[PDB]
Design a binder for these strands. Structure first.
Lengths: 92, 92, 131, 123, 123, 50
RNA sequence: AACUCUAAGCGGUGGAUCACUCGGCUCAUGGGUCGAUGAAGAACGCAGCAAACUGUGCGUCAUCGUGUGAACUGCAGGACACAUGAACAUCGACAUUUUGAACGCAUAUCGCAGUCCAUGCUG
RNA sequence: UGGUAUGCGUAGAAGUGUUUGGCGUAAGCCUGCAUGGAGCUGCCAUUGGUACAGAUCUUGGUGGAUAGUAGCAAAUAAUCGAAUGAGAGCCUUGGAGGACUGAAGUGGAGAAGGGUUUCGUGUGAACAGUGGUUGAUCACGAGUUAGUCGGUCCUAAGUUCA
């Protein structure tokens, strides 16, 4: 009778929330992500899956550290301080 | 560094709940109910309450809200009456 | 634009003025100095500073309503001036949006900052006349 | 209240700075107490001013730690990782200027007698 | 506004509309038709009669599969229905127009409906 | 489920916050495209599902 | 009559057509600037009012320093600290969560240890 | 698109409705009138993503079927009737009254699952293929407290991998 009835016995979550990507695609039984190769060094970023890379790429996230690296390059990675050529006394 | 201790007595207690049901528990059961950090292990809550507000804490029972926050129900020693202390914190 | 850094391109220029960070927005939101003030300081224009008296050279008012700028609302690209308001159906007097490129600045606030900028404007005034 | 300047902090001893952190934190809490009722200035801004005041005081005391560490580790080789010029990974390992200019004894002879001299051709 | 035929030097007239009102597109068309060019005072009495099942509204355009009612033989057509919800909304808008008529100081007795036009609103 | 793992409870809890109808004073902003909150997840209309 | 047919006027319905566009596309030009000094990406919590976008990390819609020099703005708490500074940029000093190469071991568990330093309580 | 008519133009462009008048065998053109609001065209050369009725074409919209024809019919199924409201057979509800499932339950709990759905308050449009003041709706708030129950821990089938 396994027609809609085949849908009716579907209660057992095969995939749970990815530790790497939250895309809910990690196989309990194989302990491995479809897509994002779950704790086996490589993320499985396929060049056949052009769209997959597009999701996984830089720019989908805030790119926090690396954005600051770009501006510092133009500064020629200087540690110091520019400060102030003229007065400028803070008194009340 | 060294990196300063990231759970001060302050941070542990974010707010008092002040909700309608929570206020009743001050009156009747002598409990002061606080919104707490999800990092606060109960024993954090006791320490912080004791230190900030001078109160001897008897027991602490801790709930997680479906709003991703903690509620800590802090039972006070019978020497300290709740309702005075709530209004020392300034909140009716 | 003869130099290679250089957008004549319509789409790019529209990025610049519409999406303008507030400091570029001041430049855009400059108003020319009154014929009086042009004799005194030899300055074309200054970027609107709150207590500046203003006369609106266009729409509906076309000469006068000698009033002081409440705030330069740079994100709306609009300047609101005290005494210049449009009657709403709900009796509520709401300020008329006045672009500073419609305006004469009649009175300039003097700060050490403001004077220095008038002075920059004074010094360059000599140069291209020379040229 | 008048939002703390960094300049005002920097005169003060570290003991006074830590002391002001306690006092601002008690004030932050008293203002959080107000926040419940929709606190005395109808929507509560003052809570933002004081939270950011605590941030600024923390920073000035941290910068004084940071320079304290820098002056101790000054004259001392192998300074802690966060004092080391976080430039980029590649640049750090990319051969110090001394150790790029290094020329074989023979190359010094070759160059010493025959350095390319600024001459000319022709009519 | 634009009542779409504007009757008599617009000083003699008071008007009504109602879009989007959630009543059956062509029930309203057919009830409208039974009111058109009829004295208003009689017209309300006819609409009251419809709901009281004394009289059937004649189902002229949108004929099928409307069975049959004896009570439409007054209007010479075999097929009548009592479509109560439609008749109620036309009633409300008649009373609005009469209320508007009193404001203009139009003579109550001499109100005749000279136009009803029902058009289809967005589904 | 019925007693939800803590990771699940945090994700669902954030989702409950999303299900709120936009403050109506934000709708009045200059170049405000926001008419409504439109990502309102009503649990028997849009699950979270899978 | 009604309806139907045919045409026209007017009203609907519907979004074609036009004109616009802070976007797209393609070619050219300059530069080389991720990561165990803990990345890119993910999750999580954050605005006076936000639920997202965007921004950020527990100092959470952002902080130093620096530049400019008075906004933000929907409503407002604020606005004050416009002369030492708003706010935006610069962003070279710091912070930079839980993670993820991901590093004590695990992960339908935010689960469970070991170690050093340290705090309160009891002694 | 190059050139040009020192072209037209917010004093109304283009667009478009049009028993305006006319031209050409036609492809098609102009003009009037109404609407309109911000830009546009003729001519000579120059290039094409260049003209549609169709492709069981595509995509969006709309008819006749049909303001109603299928139907909205299994589990009898209500009903008196008080309260309220804009409206009330149900849904709001008491009292009342016909019955239903007939403790192997349409009950009383939980797992697997759900994810705020629970609950109070407000209660309108949309939704409940019917109404609907009421709801698992919509809006606004609150609520899930453990040393002893589970997770945890442990191993199994089995797995992650130095």
């Amino acid at each position: 009778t396994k027609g809609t009835s085949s849908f009716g016995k579907r209660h057992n979550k095969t995939h749970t929330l990815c530790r790497r990507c939250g895309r809910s695609s990690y196989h309990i039984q194989k302990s491995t992500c479809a897509q994002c190769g779950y704790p086996a060094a490589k993320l499985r970023s396929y060049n056949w899956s052009v769209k997959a890379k597009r999701r996984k790429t830089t720019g989908t996230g805030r790119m926090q550290h690396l954005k600051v690296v770009r501006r510092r390059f133009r500064n020629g990675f200087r540690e110091g301080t520019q400060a102030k050529p003229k007065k400028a006394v803070a008194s009340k | 560094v060294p990196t300063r201790n990231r759970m001060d007595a302050y941070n542990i207690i974010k707010y008092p709940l002040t909700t309608e049901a929570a206020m009743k528990k001050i009156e009747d059961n002598n409990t002061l109910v606080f919104l707490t950090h999800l990092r606060a292990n109960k024993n954090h809550v006791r320490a912080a309450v004791r230190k900030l507000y001078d109160i001897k804490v008897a027991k602490v029972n801790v709930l997680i809200r479906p709003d991703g926050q903690k509620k800590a129900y802090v039972r006070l020693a019978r020497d300290y009456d709740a309702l005075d202390i709530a209004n020392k914190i300034g909140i009716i | 634009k003869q130099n290679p850094f250089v957008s004549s391109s319509r789409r790019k220029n529209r990025k610049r003025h519409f999406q303008a960070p507030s400091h570029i927005r001041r430049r855009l939101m400059s108003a020319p100095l009154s014929k009086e003030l042009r004799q005194k300081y030899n300055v074309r224009s200054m970027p609107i500073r709150r207590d500046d008296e203003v006369q609106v050279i266009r729409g509906h008012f076309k000469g006068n309503q000698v009033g002081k700028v409440v705030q330069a609302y740079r994100k709306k690209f609009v300047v609101y001036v005290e005494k210049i308001q449009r009657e709403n159906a709900n009796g509520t007097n709401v300020y008329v949006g006045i672009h500073p490129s419609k305006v004469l600045i009649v009175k300039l606030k003097l700060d050490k900052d403001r004077k220095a900028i008038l002075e920059r404007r004074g010094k360059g005034r000599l140069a291209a006349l020379g040229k | 209240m008048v939002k703390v300047k960094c300049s005002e902090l920097r005169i003060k001893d570290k003991k006074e700075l830590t002391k002001q952190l306690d006092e601002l934190k008690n004030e932050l809490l008293s203002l959080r107490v107000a926040k419940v009722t929709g606190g005395a200035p109808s929507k509560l801004s003052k809570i933002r001013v004081v939270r950011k005041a605590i941030a600024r005081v923390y920073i000035v005391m941290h910068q004084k730690q940071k320079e304290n560490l820098r002056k101790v580790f000054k004259n001392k080789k192998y300074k802690p990782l966060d004092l080391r010029k976080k430039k980029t990974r590649a640049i750090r390992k990319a051969l110090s200027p001394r150790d790029a200019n290094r020329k074989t004894l023979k190359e010094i002879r070759k160059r010493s007698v025959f350095p390319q001299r600024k001459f000319a051709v022709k009519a | 506004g634009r009542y779409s035929r504007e009757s008599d030097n617009v000083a003699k007239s008071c008007k009504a509309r109602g879009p989007n009102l959630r009543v059956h597109f062509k029930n309203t068309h057919e009830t409208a038709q039974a009111i058109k060019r009829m004295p208003l005072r009689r017209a309300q009495r006819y609409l009251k009669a419809v709901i009281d099942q004394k009289e059937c509204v004649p189902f002229r355009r949108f004929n099928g599969g409307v069975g049959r009612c004896a009570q439409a033989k007054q209007w010479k057509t075999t097929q009548g229905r009592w479509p109560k919800k439609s008749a109620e909304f036309l009633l409300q808008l008649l009373r609005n127009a009469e209320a508007n008529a009193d404001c203009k100081g139009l003579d109550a007795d001499r109100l005749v409906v000279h136009h009803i036009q029902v058009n289809r609103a967005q589904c | 489920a019925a007693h939800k793992s803590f990771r699940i409870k945090q994700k669902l809890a954030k989702k409950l916050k999303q299900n709120r109808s936009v403050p109506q004073w934000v709708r009045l902003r200059t170049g405000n495209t926001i008419r409504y909150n439109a990502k309102r997840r009503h649990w028997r209309r849009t699950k979270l599902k899978l």
